[PDB]
Design a protein around this ligand. Sequence first.
Ligand code: AMP
Ligand code: AMP
Ligand code: MG
Ligand code: MG
Lengths: 274, 274
Amino acid sequence: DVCEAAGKAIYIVSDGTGWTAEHSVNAALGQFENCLADRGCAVNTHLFSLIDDMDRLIEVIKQAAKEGALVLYTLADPSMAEATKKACDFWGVPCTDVLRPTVEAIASHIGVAPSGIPRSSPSRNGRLSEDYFQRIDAIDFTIKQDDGALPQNLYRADIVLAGVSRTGKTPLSIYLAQKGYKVANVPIVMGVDLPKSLFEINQDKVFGLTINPAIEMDHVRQELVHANQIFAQNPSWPVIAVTGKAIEETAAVILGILHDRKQKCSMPRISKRY
Amino acid sequence: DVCEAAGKAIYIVSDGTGWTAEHSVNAALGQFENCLADRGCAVNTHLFSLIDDMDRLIEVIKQAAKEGALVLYTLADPSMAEATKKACDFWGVPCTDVLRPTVEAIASHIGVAPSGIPRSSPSRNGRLSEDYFQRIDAIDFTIKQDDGALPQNLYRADIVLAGVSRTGKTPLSIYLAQKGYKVANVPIVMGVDLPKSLFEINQDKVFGLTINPAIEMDHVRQELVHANQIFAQNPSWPVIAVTGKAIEETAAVILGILHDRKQKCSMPRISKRY
Ligand SMILES: Nc1ncnc2c1ncn2[C@@H]1O[C@H](COP(=O)(O)O)[C@@H](O)[C@H]1O
Ligand SMILES: Nc1ncnc2c1ncn2[C@@H]1O[C@H](COP(=O)(O)O)[C@@H](O)[C@H]1O
Ligand SMILES: [Mg+2]
Ligand SMILES: [Mg+2]
C-alpha cells in the first residue's frame, strides 16, 4: 500500500524553497515539448524543500536511487554539494548542481567569495529588502481595485492594460504587480464609454491587448473591431496580440517597451540596481 | 547625454522572456547578502528578452563588453550558445550558460535529445498546457472573493489561510493561486465570529498564520493572543510563524504539509506529473 515505478522521475532538492530549481526545470522541460506532447516520454518532478542537514540529505538520495531518479539541486554550503555528488556517485544516480555555476561566475565578476549560507539558516535572516516591500504595495494596489474609483487609479498606476474581456487582464496585472508595478485594468465593452481620464494620463503606459479570433460568437468579432478602432484613435498605445501566449511572455513584451520608454537608451533593456 | 560605469554589471540574456535566468540570478545573489547589505559590492542586472537571432545577439555582447559586464544566458539553439561563448571570448568578457547543464542532464536521463528550439519560434507554439489553464481558474477564484459569499468558498478552496490582518494573507493567497491552488482567506478579528463552515470543512487544509510581535499597539498582542486560542481550539491546524519570511518560503511550508497529508508517503514531497 504505497503512492510513489511509472515514468522517468526527477528530484528537485534545495536547502531553501525548491522554486529556483523548479523554475529551471520547468523551462528545461520546454526542450522536450514534442516528446511530452504525445507521451513519447513522461516525467515526475519531486520537490524537496528545506534539506539543510546531512542525515536528511542522505535519505533523499537513498530514496532517489530507490526510485531511480535524476537529482537537480541547489545547496549554499559547499560540503553539502560535495556530499550530494559523492552520495549520488555511491548510490550510482545521475545529478547536477543547477546554480553553483551561476553563483561562481557572479563571485569572480564581483570579486567576492560566496557566503556558503542558505536562506534557511539562523544568520542574517528576516532581512527582507525594499524591492520586496514595494512588490507588496503593488500587489495590494492591483487587487484592491474597483471600477467605481477608476480615474484616480489611472494616474497612480505604473501600467494600464486596456482590452476586451477575453484578454488575460487579471492574471497579467497580478503577474506584473508581483514584479513591482501598480497595474490598472480597463475593460473595453461595446456600449460603455471609457473613462476620460484614460486619455488624460500619461499615454506612454497604456498598453492595448487583443485576441486573434483565428486562435453566433461573432459578437466577439464585433468587440475586437470596436477595440481596434479605440486603438487606432490612440496610435501611441502598443497593441499586443495575446492569444496563445503565456502571461510571463506578454509581461516581458510590456516591460521591455515600458522600460525602453521610461529610460531611453542605445540598447533597450530592463535594468535593476542591487 | 546617456543612461547606462557605476557598479559591477550583469547581463541576463534569453531567446525567450529572461525570467528563468533572472530567477537564478536573484537566488545566486543571496550568497552575497552581506556584501550587498553595506554596499560592499553593488550590482546592476540588465535583462534582454527575445534575443532569437545572430545580429541582435552580437550587438548585446558588444554592448556588454562596452559596459564591462558578465553574461548569464539561456539559449535553446546550440549554435547561438556556441556563438555566445565565442563572441564573449572574442570581446574578452565573462559568461556562463545557466541551464544547458540542466537541459542535458534531463536529456540523458529521459534519453531524448533537446529540440534546440526556443519558445519564441513559430513552430509548436500556442501549445499552452492544462496545468497553465488550471492556474488561471485558481487565480480567478482567489481574487474574485468577497467575504459575503465565504462559506461556499471554504468548501471549494484547496487551501484556507486563517490569521490576523498583519499576516501576509493576500500576497500569499495570490502566490499559491499561481501555483494551481484555489485559496480562501479568513481573517481573525477581535469581536467578529468566524464562519461555522470553517470548522465543518475538511480540517486538513486550514493553515493558521501568525506574527511574532518581537519582529498603545499591544492591541496587536491582544489579537495575537485571541488568535492563538482559536488555534489551540483547533490542534490539527499547522500554525506558521510568518514575520520576516518571504511569501515563497511560507508557501513551500504550506505546500509541503498540504502534499504530505494529501498523499501519505515514506518520504514527504511535492510531486507533479508531466
Ligand atoms: N537571501 C538569500 N540568502 C541566502 N541564500 C539564498 C537567498 N535566496 C535564495 N538563496 C539560495 O538560493 C538557492 C535557491 O533555492 P530556493 O531558494 O529554494 O528557490 C537556495 O540554495 C537558497 O539557499
Ligand atoms: N515551452 C517551451 N518551449 C521551448 N523552450 C522553452 C519553453 N519554455 C521555456 N523555454 C526556454 O527556456 C529558456 C528559459 O528562458 P525564459 O523562457 O526567458 O525564462 C529559454 O531559452 C526558452 O526558450
Ligand atoms: Mg531552489
Ligand atoms: Mg530566461
